[PDB]
Design a protein around this ligand. Sequence first.
Ligand SMILES: N=C(N)c1ccc(CNC(=O)[C@@H]2CCCN2C(=O)CNC2CCCCCC2)cc1
Ligand SMILES: [Ca+2]
Length: 223
Amino acid sequence: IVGGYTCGANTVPYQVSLNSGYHFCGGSLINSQWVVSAAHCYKSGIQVRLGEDNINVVEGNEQFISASKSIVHPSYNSNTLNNDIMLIKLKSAASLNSRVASISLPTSCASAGTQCLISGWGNTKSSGTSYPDVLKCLKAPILSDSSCKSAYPGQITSNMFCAGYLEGGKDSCQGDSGGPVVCSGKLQGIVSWGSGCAQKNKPGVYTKVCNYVSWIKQTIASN
Ligand SMILES: N=C(N)c1ccc(CNC(=O)[C@@H]2CCCN2C(=O)CNC2CCCCCC2)cc1
Ligand SMILES: [Ca+2]
């Protein structure tokens, strides 16, 4: 997260860290046994870390749970990042509490201008690298269809939306991938891609979760 702020410990209680001996992606808890992340975050040996603030210190309230299933959208395309979504099942259910909580799936798609909360342990710099220990937050609006396609012509599918700031300075970045875009209490986006981070005229691109609610429910019920 570039140009954001320290969230505060466990202020984003649905935010998880995906760990493979290091933090490599984010995700969102949607029930005590399932996490929503990005398909480009797939790998084997995923450990899900819930209740995190400082990812480099055991502070209390952490739950480490291995993934027992990682389900990439069958129609995920790694070149276009269309359908950049993955469902991860926990080997055991998480213990739900004020610091470890699920986030609601949306009832409807959000509209342009809608202000959202984007969070992660990703890169905090626009050029060069700096990774934080504690969770970072960014408030960002969803942008219009037209501006999004203007910014990335021929690359925006009906499963992507843009959010952020055309003026540069504030964005998600590498490491934030798979993390939440939450708007009005609902999971509307997944950190997916963009050109660089926080560059002018290149806003973040996010998986449009409202298009997958049925998929998510049908898949979970079947697994
Ligand atoms: N807000 C940001 N600027 C932001 C930027 C990058 C990321 C992490 N995601 C990525 O780095 C992804 C994963 C594989 C290559 N990524 C890309 O960003 C590449 N995107 C492509 C090529 C452009 C035309 C269609 C889209 C596919 C996350 C956030
Ligand atoms: Ca910790």
